[PDB]
């Protein structure tokens, strides 16, 4: 188990393997955090979150 097969490469959402390393990305309406792993909602009611 390596890269994306190892705990989703530590990504919050999408994980891709490029030049033998993990690249994380996010769904529309989220921005990749500074750590290049977490996904941050850009505004209210982001997709895929239960409302309260």
């Amino acid at each position: 188990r390596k890269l994306c097969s190892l705990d989703n490469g530590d990504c919050d959402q999408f994980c891709h393997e490029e030049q033998n390393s993990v690249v994380c990305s996010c769904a529309r309406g989220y921005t990749l955090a500074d750590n290049g792993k977490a996904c941050i909602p850009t505004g209210p009611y982001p997709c895929g979150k239960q409302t309260l």
């Binding site: 994306c4 989703n8 919050d12 959402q13 999408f14 994980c15 891709h16 990305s25 769904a27 529309r28 309406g29 996904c39 209210p44 009611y45 982001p46 997709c47 895929g48 979150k49 239960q50 409302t51 309260l52």
Partner: protein, 234 residues
Amino acid sequence: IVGGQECKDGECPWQALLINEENEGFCGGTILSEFYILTAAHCLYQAKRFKVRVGDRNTEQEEGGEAVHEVEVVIKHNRFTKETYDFDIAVLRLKTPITFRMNVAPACLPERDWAESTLMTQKTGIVSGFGRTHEKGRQSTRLKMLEVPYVDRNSCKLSSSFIITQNMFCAGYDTKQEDACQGDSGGPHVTRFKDTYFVTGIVSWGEGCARKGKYGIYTKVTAFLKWIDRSMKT
């Protein structure tokens, strides 16, 4: 939905209900964005004129969050076939945008490769709807949800009297009395990953509801991500 639990406050905010002229639900849908609803192509033949209701959990009381939306454009997959339900997918563009709020929010569209390797390999997904609570029953007046295991593809094909195409997947139980049912068609199949819910299927068909040795058959949304993207750009 047979078995499962009621959707509690805020838990299934991406649920849409296609309602006919008589204000009765006949199919479900999934909110993809302020203007678009995902549903099954076969649902389009079950009513001459329909609207889309969002933010509703109990069809017998006004919760305060409900909103009805007229459809401006129906985008039905051109390869849909009534004989097998292959390509059972449609996107609806609404005349006015959905205002998100408590009980009204979109589900996320995932990327294909990651969804197939990571989401569809999870133990379960969640199906939801206002459909029948038993094969012979009446539609539910309460929105329900059900956790459904992904089912081995070979096992599903072995179990089915009708072809399972590359555009379909199976979910549910061999004998446990839990499944989607009539009236749930077109509704969401979502998979949770780190507390974010992604669209993974569309309730499509089944040989009855919760039958022994039969599963629920869903449209494989990951096979249609580019098609959805295109339909939402025009």
